[PDB]
Amino acid sequence: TARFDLFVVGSGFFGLTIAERVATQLDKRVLVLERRPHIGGNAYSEAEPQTGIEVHKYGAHLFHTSNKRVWDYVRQFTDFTDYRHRVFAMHNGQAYQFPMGLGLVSQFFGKYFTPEQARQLIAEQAAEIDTADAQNLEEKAISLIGRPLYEAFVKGYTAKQWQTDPKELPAANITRLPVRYTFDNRYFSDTYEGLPTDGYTAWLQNMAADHRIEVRLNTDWFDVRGQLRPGSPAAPVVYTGPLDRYFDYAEGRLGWRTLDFEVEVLPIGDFQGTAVMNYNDLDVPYTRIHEFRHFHPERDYRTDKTVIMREYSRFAEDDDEPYYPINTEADRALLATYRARAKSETASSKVLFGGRLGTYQYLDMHMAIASALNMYDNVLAPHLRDGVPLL
Amino acid sequence: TARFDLFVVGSGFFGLTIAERVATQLDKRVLVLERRPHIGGNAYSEAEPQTGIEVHKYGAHLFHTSNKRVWDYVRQFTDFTDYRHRVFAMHNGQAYQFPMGLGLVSQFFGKYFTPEQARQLIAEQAAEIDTADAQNLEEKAISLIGRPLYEAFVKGYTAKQWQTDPKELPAANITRLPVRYTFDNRYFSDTYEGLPTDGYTAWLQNMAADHRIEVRLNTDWFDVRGQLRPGSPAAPVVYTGPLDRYFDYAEGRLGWRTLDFEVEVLPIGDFQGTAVMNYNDLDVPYTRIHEFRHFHPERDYRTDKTVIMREYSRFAEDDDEPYYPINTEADRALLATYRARAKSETASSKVLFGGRLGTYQYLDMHMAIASALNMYDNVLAPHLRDGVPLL
Numbered sequence A, B: 001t002a003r004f005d006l007f008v009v010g011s012g013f014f015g016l017t018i019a020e021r022v023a024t025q026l027d028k029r030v031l032v033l034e035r036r037p038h039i040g041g042n043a044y045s046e047a048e049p050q051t052g053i054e055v056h057k058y059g060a061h062l063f064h065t066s067n068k069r070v071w072d073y074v075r076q077f078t079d080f081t082d083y084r085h086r087v088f089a090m091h092n093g094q095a096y097q098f099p100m101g102l103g104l105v106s107q108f109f110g111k112y113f114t115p116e117q118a119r120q121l122i123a124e125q126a127a128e129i130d131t132a133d134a135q136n137l138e139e140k141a142i143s144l145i146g147r148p149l150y151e152a153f154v155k156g157y158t159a160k161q162w163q164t165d166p167k168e169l170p171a172a173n174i175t176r177l178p179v180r181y182t183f184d185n186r187y188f189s190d191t192y193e194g195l196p197t198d199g200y201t202a203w204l205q206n207m208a209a210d211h212r213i214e215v216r217l218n219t220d221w222f223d224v225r226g227q228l229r230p231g232s233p234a235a236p237v238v239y240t241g242p243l244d245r246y247f248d249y250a251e252g253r254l255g256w257r258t259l260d261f262e263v264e265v266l267p268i269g270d271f272q273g274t275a276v277m278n279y280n281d282l283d284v285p286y287t288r289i290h291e292f293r294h295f296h297p298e299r300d301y302r303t304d305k306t307v308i309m310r311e312y313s314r315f316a317e318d319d320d321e322p323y324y325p326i327n328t329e330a331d332r333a334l335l336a337t338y339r340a341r342a343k344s345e346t347a348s349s350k351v352l353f354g355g356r357l358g359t360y361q362y363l364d365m366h367m368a369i370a371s372a373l374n375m376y377d378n379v380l381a382p383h384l385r386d387g388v389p390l391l
C-alpha cells in the first residue's frame, strides 16, 4: 500500500500533462511538487487589478501548434480564441512589419518588391553563406534574410537577448521565425493558434483538477524527497527543474538566460496599438514591450488605462529562474555529461527528465506538452501498467 | 390549384434567401427566374482550369457580418474558413498598410506614431471639417483620416471607381472602411468573417437545392411574366433586378457603376504576395488587383502558376450589368420617384422589391441576406401564411 504511484517535480505544462495523463488514463495517484507559490510555471497569468486585463507574469505566452493530437488534448481543459499573433519591430524610430516578408522588405528598402523581386534581392544579400551550411545563428540568419536585414533586425536584438556572440549561438534559434516572401505577417506558421479564453491559470487548474492529483505549492523536491520516496518506493519521479541543479552543478553550471519584467499601468487607453513591439536598436535597454489588452481584442477593457510590460534579458544567476538555454559549444558538451548522468539516475532511482529546464531545450508550450505525451506513451504508461523498464 | 406559390426574379443572395425560406419554412413552391446562365449573381465563382483556384468571376467577394442570426443562417449551406481579409495600398511605387491605422500612418509619414500621437496628427489634418457635419464623401473622408491621407489614398482611387466628384458622392461610401488608431489592418470590423470552404457556387447551390424550388436559368422575367402569373395569380413576386429597368426607365435612368475584369494566369507562383492590392495612383487604369490563391492559404496550389484579376471601373450602360449605385443628389431624387412607383406595384400587382439592384442600395452579401430575412419575416411570411397584406 504505497501513498503515491508517481512523483512529479514541477507544475509546468510538462509536469501537469504527465500528472493528468497518469491520473486519468491509468487511474493512479500523482503527487505534484511545486517550488513556486503557484502552478503553471512561467505560463502562470494574473488579472491586473485596475483594468482586469490578464497579465502573463513571466513573459507573454502565445499558444500555437500543427500537432492535432496536442490541439485536441489541450482543448479538453480550455477553449481558444481566434487570436493570431503578430509582431512589429521598432527600428530608427519607425515601426516595421515583421518577420521576414514583403512588408518588412518594402518598408526597409523604400519601395514595393514583388515576391520574385524580393527573392532576387535577398539572394544577393545572402551571398557569403548558404542555408545548407550555416551552423550558428549569424550564418543562418544572413542566409535567410540577407545581411542588411540581419544588421538592423537581428544583430542588435540578439545582442540584448543573449549577450553572446551570434557565431556561438545555435542556428535553431533564428529558424523559430518564419521566412516568407508574401505579406503574411503572422509570427507563427502553425495550423492551430489562439489564447486561452478564460486565461492560462484556469487552463492550468483544469489539468491538475483531478482528485487523484495532489499539488503541494511552496515545496522543493530536494528538501522532501528523502521522506516522500520511502512512503512510496516503487513510484517513479518526473523532474522538470534545471538539469544542472539536480546534480548540484557537479560538472559545471549550464549557460542560461533569465528575464526581468517591468509591469506598468498607464493612464492612457493604448500605448503602442499592438500586442508585442520588438525593440531591435541598442539605444534601448529592453528587448520588447507587451501590451496585454491587444492579446484579447474580443474582450472589452476600459479605454482610460492600459497595462504594458517591458522585457529585460540578462545572464541567469544562482537565485534566478532560468528562462532560455543558450546551448553554445561548451554548453552542449556540458549537457552531454548530464544526459549520461540523467540516464544513470533513471536506471538507478527511476528518475525521468523532461521539460524546458529538465532537458536544457528551447521548448515552446506545445513542444513541451507533445514531449510529455511522448514520455507518457513510450515510457511511463508501459512502466506503471505493464512493468516495462524505464530504459 | 396554382402552379407556384411564389415568383422570385433573380437568383442572387437576396433571391435565394427568399426562395429558401419560403420553400422550407412555409412548405410552398417557389419559381426562381434567372436572366443569367448561372445562379448566385455576382457571387458566382469558378475554378480556373490550369490551377484549380476558385475565381470570383464578377468581383472578389469576402463574407463578413456581426449579425449572429445571419451567421447561423448562412452556415446551414456552407462552412467558412478562418480567412481574415486584409488589403494593401499601392502608392508611388510603395506598398502601404491599409486601411486607416498606425501601419498606414507610420509608413506615410516616415516615423512611428503612438496611438495618442496619431490621433493628434490626424486631428490637425482633419481641421476644416468635422464628422458631425460632412454630408459627402470628400468631407467625411478628410474628417476621418485627414487631408494628406485623403489625397494619396482616397482621391485618386475614388476618381477611378466613380468618375464622379467626391462632393456629390455619399458619405456612407467611405465609412465602409474602418478608421483605427492601432496596427489592426483587418479590412472589416465584423464579429464573423470567412470564405466558403467549398466555394461560393456550392454555397449558392445548397440554398436553391430544395425540390420545392425551381430555378430557370437564361430566363428573363419580363418576357415570361404575362404567361407565368396567370398560371398562379395569387403568387406574389420578388424582384431583385434594376429598379429603374422594371419601369423601363420611365422617369429616367439611375446612376450606376459597372466593372470589367481581366483574368490572367501567370507563369509565376506569386504575383503580389497578397489577396487584394489597391492601386490608388492615376498612372494606372485599374483600381485594384486580386490574387485568388491568397484567398485560400489553407488550400495548397501549384507554385509555378497563379491567377490574378485586374479590376476596371466605368459608367454602366444599357447592356451592362450594374454593380454599384452612385446615389448622387439627382440619383436619390430619381430613386424617390421609383420608390413611390414600387410602392404602387406592391399594392396593385403584389410585387416586392429587394436586393442591391432592386432597392438601388450599396448592399454587401450579409446586408442583402439580412434584408431578405427581414422581408420574409415581416412581409412575405405573414402574407403567404396568414393572408396579411403586403403593405
Ligand SMILES: Cc1cc2nc3c(=O)[nH]c(=O)nc-3n(C[C@H](O)[C@H](O)[C@H](O)COP(=O)(O)OP(=O)(O)OC[C@H]3O[C@@H](n4cnc5c(N)ncnc54)[C@H](O)[C@@H]3O)c2cc1C
Pocket (backbone or CB within 6 Å): A009, A010, A011, A012, A013, A014, A015, A033, A034, A035, A036, A039, A040, A041, A042, A043, A058, A059, A060, A061, A062, A063, A064, A219, A220, A221, A222, A240, A241, A242, A259, A323, A324, A354, A355, A356, A357, A363, A364, A365, A366, A367, A368
Ligand atoms: C518570455 C517567454 C515567452 C514564451 N512565449 C511562448 C509562446 O508564445 N508560445 C509557446 O508555445 N511557448 C512560449 N514560451 C515557452 C513556454 O513558457 C514553455 O514551453 C513552458 O514553460 C513549458 O513548460 P515546461 O514545464 O517544459 O517548463 P516550465 O513550465 O518553466 O516548468 C517548470 C516548473 O518546474 C518547477 N520547478 C523547477 N525546479 C523545481 C524544484 N526543484 N522543485 C519543485 N518545482 C520545481 C518550476 O517552479 C516551474 O514551475 C515562452 C517562454 C518565455 C520565457
Ligand SMILES: Cc1cc2nc3c(=O)[nH]c(=O)nc-3n(C[C@H](O)[C@H](O)[C@H](O)COP(=O)(O)OP(=O)(O)OC[C@H]3O[C@@H](n4cnc5c(N)ncnc54)[C@H](O)[C@@H]3O)c2cc1C
Pocket (backbone or CB within 6 Å): B009, B010, B011, B012, B013, B014, B015, B033, B034, B035, B036, B039, B040, B041, B042, B043, B058, B059, B060, B061, B062, B063, B064, B219, B220, B221, B222, B240, B241, B242, B259, B323, B324, B354, B355, B356, B357, B363, B364, B365, B366, B367, B368
Ligand atoms: C466587385 C464586388 C465585390 C464585392 N465584395 C463583397 C464582399 O467582399 N463582401 C460582401 O459582403 N459583399 C460584397 N459585394 C457585394 C455583393 O456582391 C452583393 O451584396 C450581392 O450580389 C447580393 O445579392 P443581391 O441579390 O442583393 O444582388 P445580385 O446578387 O447582383 O443579385 C441580382 C440577380 O438578379 C438577376 N436579375 C436581374 N434582373 C433580372 C431579370 N430581369 N430577370 C431575371 N433575373 C434578373 C441577376 O442575374 C442577378 O443574378 C461585392 C460586390 C462587388 C460588385
Ligand SMILES: O=c1ccn([C@@H]2O[C@H](COP(=O)(O)OP(=O)(O)O[C@H]3O[C@H](CO)[C@H](O)[C@H](O)[C@H]3O)[C@@H](O)[C@H]2O)c(=O)[nH]1
Pocket (backbone or CB within 6 Å): A060, A061, A062, A087, A089, A153, A154, A155, A157, A158, A161, A173, A174, A176, A177, A276, A278, A280, A364
Ligand atoms: O526581432 C527579432 C526577433 C527574433 N530575433 C532572434 O530570434 C530568436 C528567437 O526569437 P523569438 O521570437 O522566438 O524570441 P522569444 O523566444 O523570446 O519569443 C517568445 O516570445 C514571443 C512573443 O512575441 C513568441 O510568442 C515566442 O513564441 C516566444 O518564444 C531570438 O533569440 C533572437 O535571437 C531577433 O534577432 N530579432
Ligand SMILES: O=c1ccn([C@@H]2O[C@H](COP(=O)(O)OP(=O)(O)O[C@H]3O[C@H](CO)[C@H](O)[C@H](O)[C@H]3O)[C@@H](O)[C@H]2O)c(=O)[nH]1
Pocket (backbone or CB within 6 Å): B060, B061, B062, B087, B089, B153, B154, B155, B157, B158, B161, B173, B174, B176, B177, B276, B278, B280, B364
Ligand atoms: O484604397 C481605397 C479604398 C476605398 N476607397 C473608397 O471607399 C469606398 C469603398 O471602398 P470599398 O473597399 O468598399 O470598395 P468596394 O465596394 O469595391 O469593395 C469591395 O471589394 C473589397 C475587396 O477587397 C471588399 O470585400 C468590399 O467588401 C467590397 O464591397 C470606395 O468607393 C472608395 O471611394 C478609397 O478611396 N481608396
